Design an enzyme around this catalytic site. Structure first.
Site, PDB file in Angstrom:
ATOM      1  N   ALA A  33       8.839 -52.198  34.294  1.00 35.85           N
ATOM      2  CA  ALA A  33       8.318 -53.448  34.816  1.00 35.85           C
ATOM      3  C   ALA A  33       9.475 -54.284  35.353  1.00 35.85           C
ATOM      4  CB  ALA A  33       7.576 -54.207  33.722  1.00 35.85           C
ATOM      5  N   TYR A  56       6.231 -57.290  38.450  1.00 32.21           N
ATOM      6  CA  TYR A  56       5.397 -56.392  37.657  1.00 32.21           C
ATOM      7  C   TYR A  56       5.374 -56.696  36.161  1.00 32.21           C
ATOM      8  CZ  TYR A  56       4.652 -53.480  41.763  1.00 32.21           C
ATOM      9  OH  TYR A  56       4.266 -53.012  42.999  1.00 32.21           O
ATOM     10  N   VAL A  78       2.948 -49.496  35.052  1.00 31.62           N
ATOM     11  CA  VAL A  78       2.559 -50.681  34.290  1.00 31.62           C
ATOM     12  C   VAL A  78       1.350 -51.464  34.808  1.00 31.62           C
ATOM     13  CG1 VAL A  78       4.046 -52.332  35.485  1.00 31.62           C
ATOM     14  CG2 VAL A  78       3.449 -52.714  33.081  1.00 31.62           C
ATOM     15  N   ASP A  79       1.088 -51.413  36.110  1.00 35.47           N
ATOM     16  CA  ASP A  79      -0.051 -52.147  36.656  1.00 35.47           C
ATOM     17  C   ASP A  79      -1.362 -51.388  36.445  1.00 35.47           C
ATOM     18  OD1 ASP A  79       0.541 -51.279  40.178  1.00 35.47           O
ATOM     19  OD2 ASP A  79       1.149 -50.274  38.327  1.00 35.47           O
ATOM     20  N   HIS A 110      -4.511 -36.474  41.020  1.00 35.58           N
ATOM     21  CA  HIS A 110      -4.629 -37.703  41.799  1.00 35.58           C
ATOM     22  C   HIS A 110      -6.113 -37.914  42.099  1.00 35.58           C
ATOM     23  CE1 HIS A 110      -2.687 -40.576  44.790  1.00 35.58           C
ATOM     24  NE2 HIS A 110      -3.984 -40.724  44.987  1.00 35.58           N
ATOM     25  N   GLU A 167       6.849 -39.055  43.782  1.00 36.82           N
ATOM     26  CA  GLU A 167       5.632 -38.269  43.650  1.00 36.82           C
ATOM     27  C   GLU A 167       5.699 -36.953  44.412  1.00 36.82           C
ATOM     28  OE1 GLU A 167       1.619 -40.051  43.348  1.00 36.82           O
ATOM     29  OE2 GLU A 167       1.407 -39.393  45.432  1.00 36.82           O
TER      30      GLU A 167
END
Ligand SMILES: CCCCCCO[C@@H]1O[C@H](CO)[C@H](O)[C@H](N)[C@H]1O[C@@H]1O[C@@H](C)[C@@H](O)[C@@H](O)[C@@H]1O
Ligand SMILES: [Hg+2]
Ligand SMILES: [Hg+2]
Ligand SMILES: [Hg+2]
Ligand SMILES: [Hg+2]
EC number: 2.4.1.40
Length: 263
Positions: free
Chosen positions: A60, A64, A130-131, A151, A221
């Site tokens: 974070a 964030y 974290v979001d 995904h 990713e």
């Protein structure tokens, strides 16, 4: 390791698939975790007998830090409840970390911004964004040496549509005729050893790309997907573990929405 105690539960039916609408095991025999495929009572027993400790890591930085409160509070209600949990919050604002009440056997460490630390403090590492917020059960059914999460935007797509890095010049390159699944970087983990190997492999591949003046289409990713293509995860988590109800609703194929994005 140690014997499980007497347990009373429904007999598994050999001639009756748990789920007939989805694939529950990969071609390399790794389970694909969907609601209905596991008995959490048996699994909790197995991991508790080993006094399993799960580390949960989040980063974070900047704005964030505002998502920490909801993240931690919901994790307290749905994440590994009953087992030892060690939260690792990496942040640039140590003082902004909210003081969340934790259940017994759970602790939180704030790290302002060595790997050896993880090896002695936890058995497994779970790395998430974290979001997000936990909305339902996320437990030991996910623990294995190495796991990735499908995904939510590509679980039903053909590989050609996967947004892998397509440039041969990138170390994250994956041609159109390759690929098992498209894993999202917001939810992965496994044993401390396997996770450090993944991160070390990704960091090195990214450095090589940087030197060649190239940046993978979806950064971290893209490399995660390249790594998991060459090192098959021992478990794959269904979209139940990474969803967004506002953008994708609640399809019949998802019996539970366990970990979601915050509007
Ligand atoms: C739960 C997310 C729903 C799907 C939105 C599109 O997701 C994006 O997909 C690419 C690969 O095609 C990458 O995974 C991006 N990181 C994804 O972005 C996601 O949505 C944006 C708006 C940001 O919130 C980002 O953090 C999310 O991962
Ligand atoms: Hg991590
Ligand atoms: Hg992380
Ligand atoms: Hg990396
Ligand atoms: Hg990575």
């Amino acid at each position: 390791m140690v014997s499980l105690p007497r347990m009373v539960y429904p007999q598994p039916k050999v001639l009756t698939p748990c789920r007939k609408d989805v694939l529950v095991v990969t071609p390399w025999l790794a389970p694909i975790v969907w609601e209905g495929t596991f008995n959490i009572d048996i699994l909790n027993e197995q991991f508790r007998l080993q006094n399993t400790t799960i580390g949960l890591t989040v980063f974070a930085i900047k704005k964030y830090v505002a998502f920490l409160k909801l993240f931690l509070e919901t994790a307290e209600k749905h994440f590994m409840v009953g087992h030892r949990v060690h939260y690792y919050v990496f942040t640039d604002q140590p003082a902004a970390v909210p003081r969340v009440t934790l259940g017994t056997g759970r602790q939180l460490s704030v790290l302002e911004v060595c790997e050896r630390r993880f090896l002695s403090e936890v058995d497994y590492l779970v790395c998430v964004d974290v979001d997000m917020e936990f909305r339902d059960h996320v437990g030991v059914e996910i623990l294995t040496p190495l796991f990735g999460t499908l995904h939510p935007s590509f679980y039903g797509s053909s590989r050609e549509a996967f947004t892998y890095e397509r440039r041969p010049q990138s170390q994250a390159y994956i041609p159109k005729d390759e690929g098992d699944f498209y894993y999202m970087g917001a939810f992965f983990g496994g044993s401390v050893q396997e996770v450090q190997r993944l991160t070390r492999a990704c960091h090195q591949a990214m450095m090589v790309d940087q030197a060649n003046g190239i940046e993978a289409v979806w950064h971290d990713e893209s490399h995660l997907n390249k790594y998991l293509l060459r090192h098959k995860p021992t478990k794959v988590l269904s979209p139940e573990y990474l969803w967004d109800q506002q953008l994708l609703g609640w399809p019949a194929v998802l019996r539970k929405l366990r970990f979601t994005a915050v509007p």
